[PDB]
Design a binder for this molecule. Structure first.
Ligand SMILES: O=C(O)c1ccc2c(c1)CCNC2
Ligand SMILES: [Cl-]
Ligand SMILES: [Cl-]
Length: 79
């Protein structure tokens, strides 16, 4: 799947970064503590560890399960 524009409306299930890393679940503060949660982004579709763009980034992204890599853009292409 691909995203349109900045991907703020992307609701797919892709969960892999541009370096092949697995996205961290949005509801998790582990390994990375953060504030991109449904509490603060109720319209963001912050579901499981799905690639999302809740904060008007240029493209969908996620926190990563690698403790040494906080966040990355997802390996999704623009439509
Ligand atoms: O972890 C953070 O403080 C943080 C800050 C800014 C941005 C992200 C994460 C994700 C991408 N959008 C900008
Ligand atoms: Cl989209
Ligand atoms: Cl920001």
């Amino acid at each position: 799947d691909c995203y349109h524009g900045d991907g703020q409306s992307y609701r797919g299930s892709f969960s892999t970064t541009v370096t092949g890393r697995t996205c961290q679940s949005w509801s998790s503060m582990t390994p990375h503590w953060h504030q991109r949660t449904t509490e603060y982004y109720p319209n963001g579709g912050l579901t499981r560890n799905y690639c999302r763009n809740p904060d008007a980034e240029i493209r969908p992204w996620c926190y990563t399960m690698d403790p040494s890599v906080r966040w990355e853009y997802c390996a999704l292409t623009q439509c």
